[PDB]
Design an enzyme around this catalytic site. Structure first.
Site, PDB file in Angstrom:
ATOM      1  N   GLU A 199       0.796  -1.220   0.000  1.00 24.67           N
ATOM      2  CA  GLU A 199       0.000   0.000   0.000  1.00 24.67           C
ATOM      3  C   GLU A 199       0.833   1.276   0.000  1.00 24.67           C
ATOM      4  O   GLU A 199       2.058   1.241   0.135  1.00 24.67           O
ATOM      5  CB  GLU A 199      -0.936   0.006   1.214  1.00 24.67           C
ATOM      6  CG  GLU A 199      -0.262  -0.445   2.521  1.00 24.67           C
ATOM      7  CD  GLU A 199       0.956   0.397   2.857  1.00 24.67           C
ATOM      8  OE1 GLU A 199       0.804   1.627   3.023  1.00 24.67           O
ATOM      9  OE2 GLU A 199       2.069  -0.163   2.943  1.00 24.67           O
ATOM     10  N   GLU A 245       4.538  -0.438   1.421  1.00 27.88           N
ATOM     11  CA  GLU A 245       4.658  -0.560  -0.038  1.00 27.88           C
ATOM     12  C   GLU A 245       4.674  -1.991  -0.551  1.00 27.88           C
ATOM     13  O   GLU A 245       4.646  -2.220  -1.768  1.00 27.88           O
ATOM     14  CB  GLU A 245       5.936   0.114  -0.543  1.00 27.88           C
ATOM     15  CG  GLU A 245       6.189   1.502   0.031  1.00 27.88           C
ATOM     16  CD  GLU A 245       7.373   2.176  -0.626  1.00 27.88           C
ATOM     17  OE1 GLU A 245       8.043   1.514  -1.445  1.00 27.88           O
ATOM     18  OE2 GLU A 245       7.641   3.358  -0.324  1.00 27.88           O
TER      19      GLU A 245
HETATM   20  N1  LIG Z   1       7.970   9.183   1.584  1.00 31.15           N
HETATM   21  C1  LIG Z   1       7.253   8.099   2.084  1.00 31.15           C
HETATM   22  N2  LIG Z   1       6.529   8.241   3.247  1.00 31.15           N
HETATM   23  C2  LIG Z   1       5.805   7.205   3.789  1.00 31.15           C
HETATM   24  C3  LIG Z   1       5.833   5.953   3.095  1.00 31.15           C
HETATM   25  C4  LIG Z   1       6.586   5.862   1.911  1.00 31.15           C
HETATM   26  N3  LIG Z   1       6.455   4.614   1.469  1.00 31.15           N
HETATM   27  C5  LIG Z   1       5.677   3.957   2.327  1.00 31.15           C
HETATM   28  N4  LIG Z   1       5.252   4.734   3.348  1.00 31.15           N
HETATM   29  C6  LIG Z   1       4.362   4.296   4.530  1.00 31.15           C
HETATM   30  O1  LIG Z   1       4.040   5.396   5.349  1.00 31.15           O
HETATM   31  C7  LIG Z   1       2.580   5.609   5.411  1.00 31.15           C
HETATM   32  C8  LIG Z   1       1.981   5.199   6.734  1.00 31.15           C
HETATM   33  O2  LIG Z   1       2.578   5.992   7.791  1.00 31.15           O
HETATM   34  P1  LIG Z   1       1.782   7.227   8.452  1.00 31.15           P
HETATM   35  O3  LIG Z   1       0.478   6.691   8.975  1.00 31.15           O
HETATM   36  O4  LIG Z   1       2.624   7.796   9.527  1.00 31.15           O
HETATM   37  O5  LIG Z   1       1.502   8.283   7.446  1.00 31.15           O
HETATM   38  C9  LIG Z   1       2.069   4.873   4.171  1.00 31.15           C
HETATM   39  O6  LIG Z   1       2.171   5.654   2.970  1.00 31.15           O
HETATM   40  C10 LIG Z   1       3.012   3.695   4.157  1.00 31.15           C
HETATM   41  O7  LIG Z   1       2.996   3.016   2.897  1.00 31.15           O
HETATM   42  N5  LIG Z   1       7.289   6.916   1.403  1.00 31.15           N
HETATM   43  O1  LIG Z   2       4.598  -2.215   8.812  1.00 27.38           O
HETATM   44  C1  LIG Z   2       4.419  -1.434   7.836  1.00 27.38           C
HETATM   45  O2  LIG Z   2       4.122  -1.904   6.666  1.00 27.38           O
HETATM   46  C2  LIG Z   2       4.556   0.081   8.059  1.00 27.38           C
HETATM   47  C3  LIG Z   2       4.888   0.592   9.397  1.00 27.38           C
HETATM   48  C4  LIG Z   2       4.982   2.002   9.488  1.00 27.38           C
HETATM   49  C5  LIG Z   2       4.785   2.921   8.429  1.00 27.38           C
HETATM   50  N1  LIG Z   2       4.470   2.304   7.197  1.00 27.38           N
HETATM   51  C6  LIG Z   2       4.347   0.951   6.965  1.00 27.38           C
END
Ligand SMILES: Nc1ncc2c(ncn2[C@H]2O[C@H](COP(=O)(O)O)[C@@H](O)[C@H]2O)n1
Ligand SMILES: O=C(O)c1cccnc1
Ligand SMILES: Nc1ncc2c(ncn2[C@H]2O[C@H](COP(=O)(O)O)[C@@H](O)[C@H]2O)n1
Ligand SMILES: O=C(O)c1cccnc1
EC number: 2.4.2.21
Lengths: 342, 342
Positions: free
Chosen positions: B171, B314
């Site tokens: 995701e 991701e």
């Molecule tokens: N630059 C960047 N930032 C967050 C990312 C990401 N790739 C994956 N993530 C991860 O961080 C997010 C969840 O964390 P929160 O709830 O704190 O926002 C989602 O986008 C997750 O895929 N790249």
């Molecule tokens: O466990 C994950 O996939 C995760 C944890 C923190 C922030 N984004 C993704």
């Protein structure tokens, strides 16, 4: 050997600092790739890798040998199984061969003490036809241990000159989880009952005998925990010494070594006792299902990446982890940069 | 959708029995390859794999979407980072892209709800420009949740007809660890403080607000834990629903799905609540560094293979584990047989 140990390079802090900065700038939240980032930095510090996390050729070195302690009834497989499996290693049908092929690594089979006729296709470095029975005396002389350490060390670093950049260590030898347990007990100061396991399917009713054999070996030999070579020569075995040698060799070469399972942990405890400078080059792979695994890993201060309940040996776990080392390099070199988000 | 769920195949016990017998006969002590053996048998039971552990084409499906809850100050990155990273996914510079390439898998980027203009090269399945703010109401209507589930399910199984045999779920969506935590709290009956984490580097001083937002979302929506769709539509998000759909789709297709991290655990809890028959097709990858990971994994009764302290999302963890699934197949098909030692 003193020269060898004295020449092990310290890690390159400068390359490591540059690596850390570069990783922090990748297209991801800082530190989000956790241990993959830590691994990349560790690799960057190894001089043989030319200041950057990279993997060229890969090799798993399998040290084969028989043990006199087999006579004490500590292993369920006939002693000949060592020779048989060593031959199978040349045919590519064993567990480490299949996992190594899957990782694109080459397996080197080395006979440091099998009690059988020489096997064609196997590297010959045999010390004797099996080591002494540790229950009534030492496995070998100190001289024999030092000689094998030096021999395996040179062989390992020579491979480096052929393009190999990542090593994996393994073994083959019926009954070898007994001397492994004895070494772990001695180095960690743990009681034999807490670190003696079922090895290759030893029946639960036969465990008591194994714990007793381990205690006798220690009482009779009186190994000095502060001297890794003394321990190895007294309650170890040729295969165990050989693995220690690969670790000393790779470190001297300034290259990484992937540990395997329980047998490899006992060899790593000895190597770090002999030369603390080897520690930075060691990379754990999996968490062995052998009873004494947690204790051995704790004294090594290592947390394996893989939890597979594996207990085969042969360097099978080391091969399984190679893709993980390559992934840290791929992350380092192929990810885009944030500069290219704040 | 009822048809879809009713048509998920049970595992093939016959293929599994044949697999177990074959593995027991390999050139190694029975059970010595531990979880690699268990994995091989699990794969053998999946109908889409034709009675044998095998891996053909590999695909990671990344579900992208924005969340209204971002407005409650639960994420440190600007909302646009979702759209930016989704575009980067098409350029192959993200963490999941690099790890997927390393594993020979293809990444499919799917927009199920990004709050930005459509991104070329990204699969368009958007429900709306971001979901509703769960702190003051539901993320979406039940109808919208069911529609997306069905849509993603069909897309997933259609890929199977193109040779894909192994899926990975992922995701992208700023603030998505908030609804993920809310779902975990609801499904496991745990208090929000015990399952709310730092997500993508949320400052420690901002955690209290996040825990409060999670509690409000639950109090206001009153999601029914016994109805997975009710939970998803109320305190979930489009990306979370989409991942659940991949899991339902793969299972219907009788194929394996590799879970990723924390976000994927919340989606798997929902999928198993919706259809217990999906469970046999789920394969854990790594143990997320997110606070609520242990709790979520416990209710799923899963023990990940990799301990990497990873927390990127991701589908990066799912990609990292693919070599492990391939290794179990290599072991199964390439090892020699004992018959060929007793
Ligand atoms: N630059 C960047 N930032 C967050 C990312 C990401 N790739 C994956 N993530 C991860 O961080 C997010 C969840 O964390 P929160 O709830 O704190 O926002 C989602 O986008 C997750 O895929 N790249
Ligand atoms: O466990 C994950 O996939 C995760 C944890 C923190 C922030 N984004 C993704
Ligand atoms: N057929 C067979 N048997 C044991 C094997 C093996 N490949 C690795 N091993 C493992 O089992 C042995 C240690 O267990 P124990 O102390 O109980 O004898 C070593 O040979 C080790 O490599 N193949
Ligand atoms: O951990 C190992 O490598 C191991 C454990 C038991 C038997 N052989 C090898």
């Amino acid at each position: 050997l003193h020269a060898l140990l004295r020449d092990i390079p310290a890690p390159d802090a400068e390359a490591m600092a540059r690596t850390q900065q570069h990783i922090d700038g990748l297209l991801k939240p800082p530190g989000s790739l956790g241990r993959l980032e830590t691994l990349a930095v560790q690799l960057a510090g190894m001089p043989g890798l030319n200041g950057t996390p990279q993997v060229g050729e890969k090799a798993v070195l399998v040290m084969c040998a028989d043990h006199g302690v087999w006579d004490e009834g500590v292993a369920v497989s006939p002693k000949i199984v060592t020779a048989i499996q060593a031959a199978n290693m040349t045919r590519g049908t064993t567990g480490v061969c299949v996992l190594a092929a899957q990782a694109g690594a080459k397996v080197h089979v080395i006979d440091v003490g099998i009690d059988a006729e020489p096997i064609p296709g196997v590297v010959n470095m045999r010390v004797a036809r099996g080591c002494g029975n540790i229950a009534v005396g030492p496995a070998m002389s100190r001289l024999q241990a030092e000689a094998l350490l030096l021999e395996v060390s040179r062989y390992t670093c020579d491979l480096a000159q052929r393009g190999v950049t990542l090593f994996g260590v393994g073994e083959l030898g019926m009954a070898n989880t007994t001397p492994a347990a004895a070494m772990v007990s001695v180095f960690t100061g743990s009681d034999a009952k807490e670190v003696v396991g079922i090895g290759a399917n030893l029946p639960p009713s036969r465990i008591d005998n194994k714990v007793d054999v381990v205690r006798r070996a220690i009482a009779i030999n009186q190994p000095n925990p502060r001297d890794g070579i003394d321990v190895l020569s007294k309650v170890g075995g040729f295969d165990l010494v050989g693995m220690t040698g690969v670790m000393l060799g790779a470190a001297r070469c300034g290259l990484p070594v992937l540990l395997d399972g329980f047998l490899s942990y006992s060899a790593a405890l000895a190597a770090c006792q002999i030369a603390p400078a080897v520690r930075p080059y060691l990379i754990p792979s999996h968490f062995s299902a052998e009873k004494g695994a947690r204790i051995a890993l704790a004294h090594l201060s290592m947390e394996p990446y893989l939890h597979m309940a594996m207990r085969l040996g042969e360097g099978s776990g080391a091969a399984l982890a190679m893709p993980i080392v390559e992934a840290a390099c791929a992350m380092f070199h192929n990810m885009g940069e944030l500069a290219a988000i704040v």
